[PDB]
Paper text:
The key determinant for efficient animal-to-human and human-to-human transmissions of coronaviruses is the spike (S) glycoprotein located on the virus surface, which mediates virus entry into its host cell. The coronavirus S glycoprotein is a class I viral fusion protein that exists as a homotrimer with multiple glycosylation sites. The S glycoprotein comprises an N-terminal S1 subunit that mediates host-cell receptor recognition and a C-terminal S2 subunit that is required for fusion of the membranes of the virus and its host cell. The remaining S2 trimer, which is conserved among coronaviruses, undergoes a series of conformational changes to trigger membrane fusion between the membrane of the host cell and the viral envelope.
We produced the post-fusion SARS-CoV S2 subunit by subjecting the pre-fusion S ectodomain to trypsin digestion, receptor binding and low pH treatment, and determined the cryo-EM structure of the induced post-fusion SARS-CoV S2 trimer at a resolution of 3.9 Å. The final structure includes all domains and regions in the ectodomain of the S2 subunit (residues 688–1178), except for the fusion peptide (FP) and its downstream connecting-region (CR) motifs (residues 754–900). The structure of the post-fusion SARS-CoV S2 fusion machinery comprises a long central helical bundle surrounded by short helices and β-sheets at the distal end of the membrane. The HR1 and the central helix (CH) motifs fold into a continuous 31-turn α-helix. Three HR1-CH long helices intertwine with each other to form the stem region of the post-fusion S2 trimer with an outward orientation from the membrane side. The HR2 motif and its upstream linker region bind into the groove at the interface between the two HR1-CH helices of the neighboring protomers in an antiparallel manner, reminiscent of the six-helix bundle present in the crystal structures of the HR1 and HR2 motifs. During membrane fusion, the HR1 motif turns over to form a continuous stem helix together with the CH motif pointing toward the target membrane, which makes the post-fusion SARS-CoV S2 fusion machinery extend ~80 Å longer than the pre-fusion S2 trimer. In contrast, in the post-fusion state, the linker region no longer folds into the β-sheet with the SD3 domain, but is turned over to the opposite direction and rearranged into an extended structure mainly assembled by loops that bind along the axis of the stem helices from adjacent protomers. As described in the post-fusion MHV S2 structure, four highly conserved disulfide bonds (C720–C742, C725–C731, C1014–C1025, and C1064–C1108) are identified within the post-fusion SARS-CoV S2 trimer, which also exist in the pre-fusion state, and are located exactly around the UH, BH, and SD3 regions which are more stable than other motifs during membrane fusion. Our structure identified 8 out of 9 putative N-linked glycans, which reveal the distribution of the glycan shield covering the surface of the post-fusion SARS-CoV S2 trimer.
Residue numbers in the entry:
A (entry chain B), B (entry chain C), C (entry chain A): 688 to 753, 901 to 1178
């Protein structure tokens, strides 16, 4: 750089109060989560019970801010053969009576007690449906609560960052009530704008209101300005000074205004050369270090189950029919032989 | 303002060391989530596996801090009619045998294989109950984990805000090891209280302990003090000075103590008027901008299912009975005719 | 402390530009959650719909940054007794016909309509399985989303803390464009290293690049240095000075270099004693107040259900058999009597 250029250097001034305000404390922002999250749907209050005791410690942080007898005997034999036949028929039909009734008893057993199986399975199935739907409903609510929860946590983080700004600004308030009040700071546009004379401190709800009695340049000039000059391979350093003309005569003044005092030997300092030392750059950087998230595919497929299956539950188990008898020609010929028997 | 008032202005001093401490670094607070979240219930460790790799990158941020033959033939015909009748009866009862046994075979089919249907449905229903209860249990755990998780995330946010305060305070430490150590700062109650002479820097675990050799006013006076005076519609500005009396004679002194030097022309600066310039107010404010959350009603009713339904599962399907035969008068009259047949 | 020691005090200087950079603003880091959370698995986008409107307000904060007739008649009576017997048999077998067919009708009723019960229960059971597996899948996804969500919320918190550092650093930029530009700050190694002469401000994308024309000590000496001396139980205070020798003769100089001006009476100030005032320690501390989390055992066992149960669903309800008739000796003797009847 090194070059002579021009800085507005003040000529005539004026009084100037400043009256700046800088906050020092914070309200105890005890924010209820149950109100910020939840407005209605008492269900939400039933589920945020299960969400920890997060709001307590959250507001703990926020609080910590602030020849023819042959016929007779033979057909008598035949009649006792018919006697054999009909006692035989009584045997058959008694067996049929007990077994057809036993299979009907098994039928009643199945019907009654298998209705009871239907009743048990149907009640269990309805309760499965009920609690499945409770799971569905509350799970959707939990999605919504979790998003709204991290929004609230962002609210609290925003609040804490404000609390940190307020703490550092109160440190600046303590430093200014040191220097501006209990001293006359020789710093341009600090302790209010212009050149500080005295400051008047006064309180506020959460601030410290300053009343800086200062003075500002009412009148000046765009005037030439040189940091250092190199006559002889040889630099010149104005102690508490800046190289200035009067219309082309090199003088050195104060910075605050110019009564252009002549170049002495004492106020100038000298280097044996005019060799610039190059300085270091680029401070105040911070690395965030929030590094990386991979896919859902990696994250999921480490820890995941697909896990489905249908049933079978055949039902052709039912589907086999009942064959029947519908014959009655036996009854027909039976009663027609009964006609024949009453005939002769 | 502008008015003459009174500031304690120092008279006699005393030596004063200060010995302040300002931290510069932080411990590597590698906080395990599995310990801060989880203390017991290995179940919790089974579920926090599924909770991402959040704790890794979380501690990455925290790490980045640091004639009578008629009879014979006719009744022989009738006897063969009875032969027809009993072969006919054999036909009927064989049909009944096969069909009653077939309906019993269908009954055994239903009983065996429909027990197998009950076994399949009951095992599936128990597994439905099992995994439903796993869902219920782990879902409640997930509520609790999510609340405790955001409490941990608040812990980390609190920690990072401390890290930011430490970084800015270490910037102040670098600035004070510049000015207090390598210079004699002309700043009241900076570089320790009082007026700095020299500071002695020394290390600490995570701080830089200063030893500010300063000097403080042991003796002073509540004494009158004026910023500027307006004789002639015309202001007066003491350069490095403050208007002071000796008991009513206007002098201007240093701020640091008063040897009340007389009003010169050079130390006073003058405005042509006494016109206050009014200054700007109210800096250092930040807008949080955390704006808004609506109801659960809006948020929910965009994306929600109620979604319930019962079954029917009739059971009168069972409830139709089995009619029976319980008659035996046929057997009674049958064996009584058998008595009659053995009679004659 | 109080002791005479040695500070490098400058002798000959050199010009030195500094060229430091301090950022003042931030890019509008409108970070999409749907990209930072979600990369693939459109399912994830189906579930993050249910996760509030968190990303909107999240980026609202981030945006707010920037003889043989006896025989005839008697056996005619017996023949009508057989007529009674076979009409009686017709009665029995008609009753058996209707009842065996009725129990078969009940069997068909059970088979058809109980297949319909199996169909209803099986379809409901498959849908239970389906939506249970949807619950399982999406619940695991919600674990993963919640962990990745708080990682994103940590990203945003990290970003906001950077925004606070940038706001305070821009306050330092405003203070340096006050003092370094519009003044000549008498502060060592502030407004760039060395001793400030003038600074040249120039813009940047998000910074304010300074060009501090300063001057640094090219040449100096480790030289003795005393804060205060106690001849007579009586201290000595060099105003804008430091006690210095020339090779053992006590002088007081400037801090910036040494032309060792003689000890006057005016530049030294005096205490009547040599009594050190001890100062206060250990500022800039903040209490985090993130206090406490108890066990899962406390947190859980306040609000938790274990809640399991099996079924019974007997199945011996089926398991009772069907007894049968398999007899046919009646048919055998029946047709053998039919042989006997056709004989005679
Ligand atoms: C400014 O600096 C130049 C050298 O760059 C010098 O020759 C000149 O005399 C200086 N003054 C003016 C008024 O240009
Ligand atoms: C010179 O004065 C003008 C007045 O209009 C103002 O722009 C500024 O003070 C100076 N101009 C420059 C530095 O370009
Ligand atoms: C600067 O110096 C004198 C005295 O201040 C002034 O009168 C004159 O106009 C200027 N120029 C010179 C001496 O060349
Ligand atoms: C640098 O120091 C030496 C030491 O005697 C002195 O002779 C010389 O004048 C100094 N240089 C300047 C420019 O003052
Ligand atoms: C300052 O440092 C950052 C580090 O990321 C770099 O990107 C930037 O280019 C540097 N500034 C200049 C002017 O090179
Ligand atoms: C297995 O999981 C993947 C993961 O997206 C998904 O497509 C589906 O639920 C399952 N089945 C198949 C065939 O991918
Ligand atoms: C009725 O009987 C059989 C038994 O094997 C069954 O499979 C089928 O459905 C029916 N038979 C027909 C319709 O011919
Ligand atoms: C059947 O025969 C009997 C005698 O065997 C006699 O009463 C009559 O002729 C017939 N009818 C009735 C109804 O008895
Ligand atoms: C204070 O200011 C008033 C004007 O407000 C002036 O008359 C007076 O002389 C000053 N001094 C004292 C000691 O009151
Ligand atoms: C005047 O001195 C008293 C001493 O008790 C003290 O309150 C303060 O220094 C002054 N009082 C004021 C300014 O009200
Ligand atoms: C203030 O000035 C003189 C000299 O310091 C002092 O003796 C006198 O008492 C004071 N008052 C006057 C001169 O009215
Ligand atoms: C203001 O500047 C003019 C310019 O010559 C000068 O005459 C006047 O004395 C100045 N005013 C004061 C109060 O110094
Ligand atoms: C400072 O600005 C804030 C902006 O919200 C305002 O509320 C407050 O009233 C201002 N201060 C004064 C003293 O008016
Ligand atoms: C539909 O959802 C609402 C939402 O609170 C709730 O009352 C219930 O689960 C459902 N039914 C009715 C009738 O509101
Ligand atoms: C048994 O039979 C009928 C079949 O239609 C059934 O509905 C009913 O329960 C029973 N009848 C009675 C008890 O009269
Ligand atoms: C039945 O009649 C037979 C001959 O027809 C004869 O043995 C007896 O009288 C009766 N009883 C028995 C048991 O046979
Ligand atoms: C340093 O201080 C001691 C007293 O501690 C004093 O006797 C001595 O003369 C001083 N100077 C040197 C050069 O040691
Ligand atoms: C004295 O000079 C040496 C030069 O090597 C350097 O270590 C430092 O400036 C001084 N040494 C100290 C203070 O121990
Ligand atoms: C310090 O003072 C004189 C004059 O600066 C110097 O010549 C001498 O060497 C020193 N020592 C004394 C006077 O003992
Ligand atoms: C302290 O103040 C008194 C008041 O007159 C004065 O006599 C004495 O000299 C002062 N002490 C010092 C060391 O100046
Ligand atoms: C500073 O205060 C903290 C408060 O926790 C304390 O632990 C520490 O020991 C103090 N420093 C010293 C040097 O005692
Ligand atoms: C009850 O809950 C506990 C909690 O860990 C767990 O062991 C299990 O799920 C249940 N049963 C028993 C016997 O503990
Ligand atoms: C078949 O009949 C009975 C009915 O009580 C049933 O309990 C059992 O399983 C069978 N009886 C046997 C195998 O003896
Ligand atoms: C049975 O007897 C009838 C007459 O009663 C006669 O036709 C024959 O002898 C026998 N066989 C058949 C097939 O009728």
């Amino acid at each position: 750089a090194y070059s002579n250029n021009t800085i507005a250097i003040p000529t005539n001034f004026s009084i100037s109060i400043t009256t700046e305000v800088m906050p020092v404390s914070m309200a105890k922002t005890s924010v209820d989560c149950n109100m910020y999250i939840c407005g209605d749907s008492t269900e939400c209050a039933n589920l945020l019970l299960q969400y920890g005791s997060f709001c307590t410690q959250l507001n703990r942080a926020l609080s910590g801010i602030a020849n023819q007898k042959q016929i007779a005997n033979q057909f008598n034999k035949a009649i006792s053969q018919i006697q054999e036949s009909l006692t035989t028929t009584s045997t058959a039909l008694g067996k049929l009576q007990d077994v057809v009734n036993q299979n009907a008893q098994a039928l009643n057993t199945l019907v009654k007690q298998l209705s009871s199986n239907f009743g048990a399975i149907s009640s269990v199935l309805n309760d499965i449906l009920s609690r499945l739907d409770k799971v569905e409903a509350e799970v959707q609510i939990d999605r919504l609560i979790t998003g709204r929860l991290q929004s609230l946590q962002t609210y609290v983080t925003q609040q804490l960052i404000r609390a940190a700004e307020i703490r550092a600004s109160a440190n600046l308030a303590a430093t200014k009530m040191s220097e501006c009040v209990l001293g006359q700071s020789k710093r341009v546009d600090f302790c209010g704008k212009g050149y500080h004379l005295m400051s008047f401190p006064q309180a506020a709800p959460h601030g410290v209101v300053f009343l800086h009695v200062t003075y500002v340049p009412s009148q000046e000039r765009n005037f030439t300005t040189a940091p250092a000059i190199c006559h002889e391979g040889k630099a010149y350093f104005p102690r508490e000074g800046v190289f200035v003309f009067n219309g082309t005569s090199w003088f050195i003044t104060q910075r605050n205004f110019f009564s252009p005092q002549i170049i002495t030997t004492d106020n100038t300092f000298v280097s044996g050369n005019c060799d610039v030392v190059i300085g270091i750059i680029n401070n105040t950087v911070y690395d965030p270090l929030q590094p990386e998230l991979d896919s859902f595919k990696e994250e999921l497929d480490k820890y995941f189950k697909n896990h489905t299956s249908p049933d079978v539950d055949l039902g052709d188990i039912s589907g086999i029919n009942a064959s029947v008898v519908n014959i009655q020609k036996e009854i027909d010929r039976l009663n027609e032989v009964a006609k024949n028997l009453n005939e002769s």
